[PDB]
Design a protein around this ligand. Sequence first.
Ligand SMILES: Nc1nc2c(ncn2[C@@H]2O[C@@H]3COP(=O)(O)O[C@H]4[C@@H](O)[C@H](n5cnc6c(=O)[nH]c(N)nc65)O[C@@H]4COP(=O)(O)O[C@H]3[C@H]2O)c(=O)[nH]1
Ligand SMILES: Nc1nc2c(ncn2[C@@H]2O[C@@H]3COP(=O)(O)O[C@H]4[C@@H](O)[C@H](n5cnc6c(=O)[nH]c(N)nc65)O[C@@H]4COP(=O)(O)O[C@H]3[C@H]2O)c(=O)[nH]1
Ligand SMILES: Cc1cc2nc3c(=O)[nH]c(=O)nc-3n(C[C@H](O)[C@H](O)[C@H](O)COP(=O)(O)O)c2cc1C
Ligand SMILES: Cc1cc2nc3c(=O)[nH]c(=O)nc-3n(C[C@H](O)[C@H](O)[C@H](O)COP(=O)(O)O)c2cc1C
Lengths: 374, 372
Amino acid sequence: MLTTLIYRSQVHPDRPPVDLDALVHRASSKNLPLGITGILLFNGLQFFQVLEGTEEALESLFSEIQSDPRHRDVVELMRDYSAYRRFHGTGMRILDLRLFETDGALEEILRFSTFGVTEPVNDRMFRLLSAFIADGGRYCLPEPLQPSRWMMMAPQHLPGQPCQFALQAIVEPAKKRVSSFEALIRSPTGGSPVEMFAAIAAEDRYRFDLESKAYAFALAGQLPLGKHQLAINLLPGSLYHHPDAVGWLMDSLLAAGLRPDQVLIEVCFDQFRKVLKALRVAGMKLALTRFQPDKIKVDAELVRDIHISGTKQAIVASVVRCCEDLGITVVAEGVETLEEWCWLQSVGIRLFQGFLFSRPCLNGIGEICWPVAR
Amino acid sequence: MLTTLIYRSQVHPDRPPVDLDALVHRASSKNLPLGITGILLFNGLQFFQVLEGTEEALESLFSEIQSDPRHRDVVELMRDYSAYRRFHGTGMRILDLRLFETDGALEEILRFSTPVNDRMFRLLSAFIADGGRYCLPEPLQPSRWMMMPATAAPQHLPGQPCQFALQAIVEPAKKRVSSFEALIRSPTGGSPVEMFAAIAAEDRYRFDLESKAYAFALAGQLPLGKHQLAINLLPGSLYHHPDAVGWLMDSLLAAGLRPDQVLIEDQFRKVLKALRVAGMKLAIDLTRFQPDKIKVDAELVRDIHISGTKQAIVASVVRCCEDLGITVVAEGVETLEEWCWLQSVGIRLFQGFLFSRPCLNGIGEICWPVAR
Ligand SMILES: Nc1nc2c(ncn2[C@@H]2O[C@@H]3COP(=O)(O)O[C@H]4[C@@H](O)[C@H](n5cnc6c(=O)[nH]c(N)nc65)O[C@@H]4COP(=O)(O)O[C@H]3[C@H]2O)c(=O)[nH]1
Ligand SMILES: Nc1nc2c(ncn2[C@@H]2O[C@@H]3COP(=O)(O)O[C@H]4[C@@H](O)[C@H](n5cnc6c(=O)[nH]c(N)nc65)O[C@@H]4COP(=O)(O)O[C@H]3[C@H]2O)c(=O)[nH]1
Ligand SMILES: Cc1cc2nc3c(=O)[nH]c(=O)nc-3n(C[C@H](O)[C@H](O)[C@H](O)COP(=O)(O)O)c2cc1C
Ligand SMILES: Cc1cc2nc3c(=O)[nH]c(=O)nc-3n(C[C@H](O)[C@H](O)[C@H](O)COP(=O)(O)O)c2cc1C
């Protein structure tokens, strides 16, 4: 089956310039008997390749390409089935973009390529080609943010309580500063939030979720929360199926020595409106045209393998800029590797949550690891 | 009930400078007895104002502010209920950001304010750091543009269980029609709702798919040429038959069209795979999967000229789709004010009554924005 694969990479600037001649001749000779067509673009620092061929042929070729020491930071942009080949003849075609002016590069690409009966701009491949020629250095990883240049650097359980809480830091590595702490519910035997709520009866869950927060607040009050925010998780029903859950939380957090604005609530268009209204007037924080939260948390699945995914990179960069304009805090969660942190920081993330920095800590403030040079 | 209203606006650069000392002193004197507080930021070209008070007091005041000829392009950024007053004992006060070094404006704020965890402060910082981002450029002012017509021949085609209206998706910069959208009509020329209501519930998926033959037939004898064509389809109409994709193929080819010319606006993945293999394009009317086109909803387009939220969402949708290589169309564009602001955030393809009204079985008349 005919498949299109599009990736982007960059060279090592510290090493001798990559031999484009030897690269292209060997590529052309190897691609032809395998039925592989396409084009390679080079701007001095970055490569950009379109590959067309069978799924079997492209999976094999890309593995060799990924593992090639001539380039690094291989970022996959597109991988889809195709109805027709855009590129014809076959040497692997190559353009050194340093030799082309404005629209001369697009003109040479369009010389031998076919993009159907409609305008080439209607083809995703052509648009991606155009974006690299126009602004390829956009998602080019900066030298200070190369992963290889970085490396990484007590309290008891309480079984007698109906529930307990583990605290995880949300950190800002650039200023080596804790931004907030999130309270995460744990069972009396140390189990996860799933295990806890499964041991509670179905008709009792909402009320348990709300009343569990008293233990999180008490934990937060006994710990040195030096003007740090505390985030707590709540089911929509826990706030809604209660006469005054906002007022309940208010009385509970104030009795523990906390302020309204110090507490953030992490979470049905109908029931949420009058609840958020009361939470806002109380002074608590919440985490687009209808309403705006104080914080948006980029999920772990967008964070996972962000260094190789041009889609995930584009989405996260789009979230950062939008939230900046709206005045909404952004936190990337589920950060497990140096690579993820580097790439998330390159697209504008400054606040992080994950096992790389700080693991959840049962009934206390855990230790934080910070990324340092070399 | 305390509320916060934040907006940005722009000066008139070719008119005598507004006496801001007079305005702010008058503002401060009027605001405080009415329980209104806040600040004004000035960067030479733009205003940024935070207003605090009751919902009723701010509505009445902001209404006077919107109709004030001393400024233009008033764009609302925030209107939300508020826990506490941030600018207590400050009716109104101006900060000229040009008289401050970096951090200086923000530090002054914090000395008469009553930080980064607050939305208002982040927005203040955003205007201080890069206020000119959504500053509407001079050649894109609504009054520097006029719509002018470029004739429509609508026809009734009897002997058909359905009809189709065609609406152009246009590219004003190249004065070019990008594609035509097929919109289903009843035999009497009634709405899509009017058409589907005549069809029995169990036959609605079969009818939706098989009605496309008449859309293909219309596009072919037009002739379509080098232009695209949505068709819209229900997901169920694609599952209804195992060779639904193969049937659409046969139908468009028999109408003299190409696969790459046709765009369609669990279970779904297998169909998506079949649509790509065949060569047809797909639109949403992201990591798993990527369409060829996304269409910005009419609600986001409505009042985008006065909504900073909608401005921000659309801009980053545009930028995201640029990086993904996805075509972006703004739908429901009714006014020049909308077109100008969509153009300023990076939209280049447009659909709406401003440009082209849907035309029963034929290519309608198109209007273009021309510079003044
Ligand atoms: N794979 C990975 N995971 C990481 C990493 N860093 C942190 N996590 C984890 O992700 C969860 C916190 O994210 P959440 O979106 O608040 O998701 C939480 C949160 O929604 C939640 N939850 C916690 N406490 C409560 C509660 O009291 N009430 C309700 N309704 N939900 C709660 O249940 C969810 C599952 O929570 P947890 O088992 O405590 O697991 C925690 C946590 O340990 C990482 O680097 N990699
Ligand atoms: N207010 C306003 N409206 C504008 C403007 N410009 C275009 N429109 C309209 O918006 C509709 C096209 O948008 P759609 O999301 O495809 O929405 C369409 C489309 O989803 C649809 N539809 C049309 N044909 C079919 C079909 O064959 N099958 C299915 N399943 N749905 C269809 O039903 C919807 C109703 O379509 P229509 O009556 O044809 O109404 C058209 C159209 O007249 C504007 O500037 N302002
Ligand atoms: C940016 C770049 C593009 C490449 N393109 C191709 C190509 O399209 N075809 C190919 O066979 N090898 C290509 N390679 C080289 C492969 O990574 C690998 O070195 C080569 O295929 C090994 O083949 P061999 O066993 O004949 O030495 C490329 C390498 C780089 C750095
Ligand atoms: C940038 C801008 C900000 C303004 N802010 C206020 C204000 O905060 N309070 C106020 O009363 N008028 C403000 N005005 C002026 C009003 O639009 C309006 O002219 C005035 O309130 C009319 O009331 P008056 O007739 O009593 O002077 C502002 C005008 C502009 C251009």
